[PDB]
Design a protein around this ligand. Sequence first.
Ligand SMILES: N[C@@H](Cc1ccc(O)cc1)C(=O)O
Ligand SMILES: N[C@@H](Cc1ccc(O)cc1)C(=O)O
Ligand SMILES: [Zn+2]
Ligand SMILES: [Zn+2]
Ligand SMILES: [Zn+2]
Ligand SMILES: [Zn+2]
Lengths: 457, 459
Amino acid sequence: PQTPDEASLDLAATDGIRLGDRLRGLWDLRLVGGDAELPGLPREGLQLVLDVAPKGRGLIGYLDTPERLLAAEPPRFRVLGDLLGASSASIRWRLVDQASGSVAPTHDCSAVFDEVWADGTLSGRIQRLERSPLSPNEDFRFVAVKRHFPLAHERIVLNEKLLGWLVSPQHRLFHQLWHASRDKWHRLSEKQRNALRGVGWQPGPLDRERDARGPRKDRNASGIDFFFMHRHMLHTARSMQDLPSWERLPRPVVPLEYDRPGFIRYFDNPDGFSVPPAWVAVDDDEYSEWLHGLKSAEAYHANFLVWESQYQDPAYLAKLTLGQFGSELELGMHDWLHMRWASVTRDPSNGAPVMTDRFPADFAPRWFRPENDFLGDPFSSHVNPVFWSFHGWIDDRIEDWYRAHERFHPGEVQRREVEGIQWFAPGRWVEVGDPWLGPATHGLDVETMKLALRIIF
Amino acid sequence: PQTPDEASLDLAATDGIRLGDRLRGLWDLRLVGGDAELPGLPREGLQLVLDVAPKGRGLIGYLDTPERLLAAEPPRFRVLGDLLGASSASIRWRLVDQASGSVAPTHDCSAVFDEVWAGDGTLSGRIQRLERSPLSPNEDFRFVAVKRHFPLAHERIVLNEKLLGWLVSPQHRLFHQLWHASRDKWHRLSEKQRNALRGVGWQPGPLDRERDARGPRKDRNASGIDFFFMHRHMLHTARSMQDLPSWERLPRPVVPLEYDRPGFIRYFDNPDGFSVPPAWVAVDDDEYSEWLHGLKSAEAYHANFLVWESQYQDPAYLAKLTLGQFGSELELGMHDWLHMRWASVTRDPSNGAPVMTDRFPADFAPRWFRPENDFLGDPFSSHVNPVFWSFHGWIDDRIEDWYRAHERFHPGEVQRREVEGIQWFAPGRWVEVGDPWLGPATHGLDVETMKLALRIIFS
Ligand SMILES: N[C@@H](Cc1ccc(O)cc1)C(=O)O
Ligand SMILES: N[C@@H](Cc1ccc(O)cc1)C(=O)O
Ligand SMILES: [Zn+2]
Ligand SMILES: [Zn+2]
Ligand SMILES: [Zn+2]
Ligand SMILES: [Zn+2]
């Protein structure tokens, strides 16, 4: 056999990328055995922090007490390893004694990854490199447990008044149905359309419906409905609680290489704005790869950072009517904002992860509990505290669109109050003047909305 | 026409990646015009720092005085823009007044990128106050930026007169080139050429039992032992003239501008000389340019260099290799990549301007022998680069990890020994041969002879 003639960029594959994602984070460590002792460290109450680049094959980390990991001084032990030939069955890394004054490894570690559904488990053995392998077996083993990634609602608390208004069946169904009709109107048969008209849930004015995802979606003023309704939802919600809008989009997690305490803090999700780790959908690899990149860091620099720039650039906004700006923003950024900060679908009763997303027609009573705040569903997305941070951001950009036109087209856009909400008069850049707030404007009953949703799905 | 039905990951392309690389770095800014004024900032002595992700399309940065950019407090102005439809012809970004208490842009900027070979780049354009109306008389608000020179290694790591004089000597430049040339090319030489190298005593290794370095049996012919020993021999004599500490760890890639603004700036001053020099676009050779670019990228550090740093310090990994294997494996993969990762653009010996055409291996003009030539991509000059000795010291230290690894799994099967006044190891189960090749000295300097041998190989 012949060895390679030169080195070649060895980017991680799907299996290697997924392995690194199982490891990246903060772990609580425990030493077991008669010979289980690390210089200057207890046997209990330890932590293991690890990190792997998005497509990297090298493994890094640190092993010390919780306080020392956050302190600026170099931790007592540093991790170095690689994932070549690694898997859930075998992972290996070495420990460097930062106090010994030498980068030479002092210990050799192996581990196996497991899953417990009663966020991760690592267990294996450690070997002192000074000890000889021909000596009696050394009872040195460890067990690690990946620390729970806090949910948004576990860090941003919505008071009972507001939260009670969101989780109400009269509101969950409204939001789902408000999106459902316009999202699917362009694919409904005439029989279905006539039925929605029979209950007053046609998207927009009767016989002049504004489909949201049809061919004329950009020109049919549908965007005006999206902006206005969600601003209407903000106004009433902000009267019950202070809901500051995002000023900037949260940056991706800082690598463990450059800010060890910051990296650790990110996995505690202190401000609730941390990107939840992606989850692998069963028997749907195309969707899993889609969600993964949507949450990656290169998607932040390739897409989310471009949107934050475009929708605050005057020259870019001055070219769009409110109907265009809304439809463009909703179809691209809005849908991606939800899934980027979306956590895994969970059972409302117990909170354990549920791989199968809720069926749109499933109206069981358990789904109505406050535990269900899945951002991937309009029936529950409005419950997530992050929902209101980035929808406040979107709304504020409407003023950038007004300021832009006053610069390039002074006078062609006029403000106006509509339904007790600051808005704009119909004109050259405002296609229509009757925003669609459901049957209230172009016609709540809970049993009716269940029917309408049943018609659609 | 129909608008997109959903968003799709829009990673930068070749043209977009190259644009972001032209911008990333620290610029010296200067405002020109009658209406050229930023609240709380002078017109002269400014700096513009910018950054772009490896495959990103969004542009960020800061604009303030040199001192404030390094200070911990938020700079006076923050940059936001994108590179959609941008190029050397048009680049646009907005400025945010961080003091105003609002993330709303206060100014709108455009610029054109230029190159001057008479600085590493030039940006010039106009700025517009967004409060001012466009129907008003034209505002004389423009700026000019000049990308700051990326310091070379030898501009920050100084080799004393004794050592530097020994490296740039014609008797040493040719030795290093020829020592690599023969074994690197031996497996492709005709018998006529081989006999000639034997006629001058420059056959790689023992006569009639030559150790090709890049042939099929490269891993089993003990050639790796030649690579490790010679460069350790080079270290020993070099470290007698100057203290040259070896790398303990491989320098991490530059910190993104989002997480450490002062650190990002410091990296582009190359303070310790270990900063990765930016890649250069080779003319009419896109395959090599893409290769060099990735070799220097950050994902190559996490995919390759960090794996090598792990493997060659893992006992279980080293215990499976004989020294001849460990040498051949490391040289063909890591060694060659370490050179090109920290390599700067080839420069003319006369002046510091870049020369796109690498020196011809047969070109022995007198100008190439000046100390200015420290191109890491050529053995004729790689030993002059100060970084050369940092990572070659690292490689050498890994040989001891290879001994400690065998002493753990195979105690006694590897024995130390002194060879040519150098700490080494005795021939055995894991040491294939006991006559390292230090050139004609061991298996046989004359400057005219080495010039001949090199001419035989390349012409
Ligand atoms: N869940 C949809 C988008 C969406 C999310 C929340 C909503 O409220 C409405 C729509 C998706 O797959 O992106
Ligand atoms: N020139 C080789 C690397 C190299 C450089 C200097 C040497 O001394 C040896 C090898 C390359 O293209 O990577
Ligand atoms: Zn939404
Ligand atoms: Zn909604
Ligand atoms: Zn070298
Ligand atoms: Zn060399």
